[PDB]
A paper describes a structure:
RIFIN, a large family of Plasmodium variant surface antigens, plays a crucial role in malaria pathogenesis by mediating immune suppression through activation of inhibitory receptors such as LAIR1, and antibodies with LAIR1 inserts have been identified that bind infected erythrocytes through RIFIN. RIFIN also mediates immune suppression through activation of inhibitory immune receptors including leukocyte-associated immunoglobulin-like receptor 1 (LAIR1) and leukocyte immunoglobulin-like receptor B1 (LILRB1). Notably, human monoclonal antibodies that contain LAIR1-domain insertions in either switch region or between V and DJ regions have been isolated from donors, who have had malaria. To define the structural basis underpinning interactions between wild-type and antibody-inserted LAIR1 and polymorphic RIFIN, we investigated the overall architecture of three types of LAIR1-inserted antibodies, determined crystal structures of LAIR1 in complex with the RIFIN-interactive regions from two RIFINs (PF3D7_1040300 and PF3D7_0401300), and used the resultant structural information to derive a LAIR1-binding signature and to identify RIFINS from diverse Plasmodium species capable of recognizing LAIR1.
Phylogenetic analysis of the RIFIN-V2 apex sequence revealed two additional 3D7 RIFINs, referred to as RIF3 (PF3D7_0401300) and RIF4 (PF3D7_0401200), to be in the same branch as the initially identified LAIR1-positive RIFINs (RIF1 and RIF2). A similar approach also identified seven RIFINs in non-3D7 strains. Co-immunoprecipitation (co-IP) assays confirmed LAIR1 interaction with the newly identified 3D7 RIFINs, RIF3 and RIF4, and with three of the non-3D7 RIFINs. To provide insight into the recognition of these RIFINs, we determined the structure of the RIF3-V2 domain in complex with MGD21 LAIR1 at 2.5 Å resolution. The RIF3-LAIR1 structure resembled that of RIF1-LAIR1 with an overall rmsd of 1.46 Å over 546 Cα atoms, despite clear diversity in the primary RIFIN sequences at the binding interface. Structural analysis and sequence comparison of the LAIR1-RIFIN complex suggested a set of four conserved residues contributing to LAIR1-binding capacity, including residues D247, C254, C265 and R268. The interface between RIFIN-V2 apex and LAIR1 C-C’ region largely comprises hydrophobic interactions and backbone-mediated hydrogen bonds, and the interface is facilitated by an induced conformational fit of flexible RIFIN-V2 apex loops.
Residue numbers in the entry:
A (entry chain D): 191 to 306
B (entry chain C): 108 to 205
């Protein structure tokens, strides 16, 4: 009785973490965030905390898709800048990366909970 | 349309010995808000807002690699943002590391 409410509660938390992790992996083609695995990343921060995840993804994108670093192992992650119209297009106004990431993460968390 | 094309140069040159330094200098008109240094791909870039107005009509931004490796080799180009529009990109510059 008491320990099935326990296994039930962690089964639900696992399915939520799994939903957001799959969504971030499939959309950003990333397996790690902020120096740790996405499963390890979601032990400390909430599964629907759009602001924290978007800021961490922004910081990682600026750090791993730069002109200085040389060879970028993960091109697909940087390629997301083209999806979010973040790459410079002559004649048009600036699109901030953090804001586009925030909108994307918003859709992804809504989609994961929509699974729920 | 009214924005002039930026130019890209490398100092001390396009051929850098392995381990040595190189600096890409992006030049545009006065009032550049942001310079963006792009690689062969649009999504691989570095931005800077420390733009120094050298002359009443020419401003520049510098992107410096202290120690190049083989992965730094390849194409680079400049683009700048001014008056709510990105300018057209400069021509590509090939960095050769030996
Ligand atoms: C993202 O990576 C950073 C590290 O680069 C992690 O930041 C650190 O997170 C811990 C909480 O897990 C913060 O709390 C504690 O701070 C006290 C001082 O108040 C210190 O005594 C503890 O040892 C621990 O550091 C810490 O301040 C924080 N530091 C920074 C620079 O952010 C962060 O947790 C990572 N985020 C995720 C979701 O993994």
């Amino acid at each position: 009785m008491i320990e099935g409410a326990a296994q039930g509660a962690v089964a639900g938390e696992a399915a939520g973490r799994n939903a957001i992790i799959g969504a971030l992996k499939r959309y950003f083609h990333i397996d790690n965030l902020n120096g740790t695995s996405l499963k390890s990343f979601f032990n400390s921060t909430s599964y629907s905390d759009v602001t924290t995840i978007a800021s961490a993804i922004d910081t990682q994108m600026t750090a791993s898709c730069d002109a200085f670093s040389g060879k970028i192992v993960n091109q697909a992650f940087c390629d997301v800048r083209k999806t979010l119209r973040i790459v410079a297009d002559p004649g048009k106004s600036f699109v901030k990366q953090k804001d586009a990431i925030t909108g994307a993460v918003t859709q992804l968390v809504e989609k994961a909970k929509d699974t729920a | 349309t009214d924005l002039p094309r930026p130019s890209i140069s490398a100092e001390p040159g396009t051929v850098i010995p392995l381990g040595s330094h190189v600096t890409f200098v992006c030049r545009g008109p006065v009032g550049v808000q942001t310079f963006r240094l792009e690689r062969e791909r649009n999504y691989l870039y570095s931005d800077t807002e420390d733009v120094s107005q050298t002359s009443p009509s020419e401003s520049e931004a510098r992107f410096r690699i202290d120690s190049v490796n083989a992965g730094n080799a390849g194409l680079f180009r400049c683009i700048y943002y001014k008056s709510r529009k990105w300018s057209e990109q400069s021509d590509y510059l090939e960095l050769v590391v030996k």
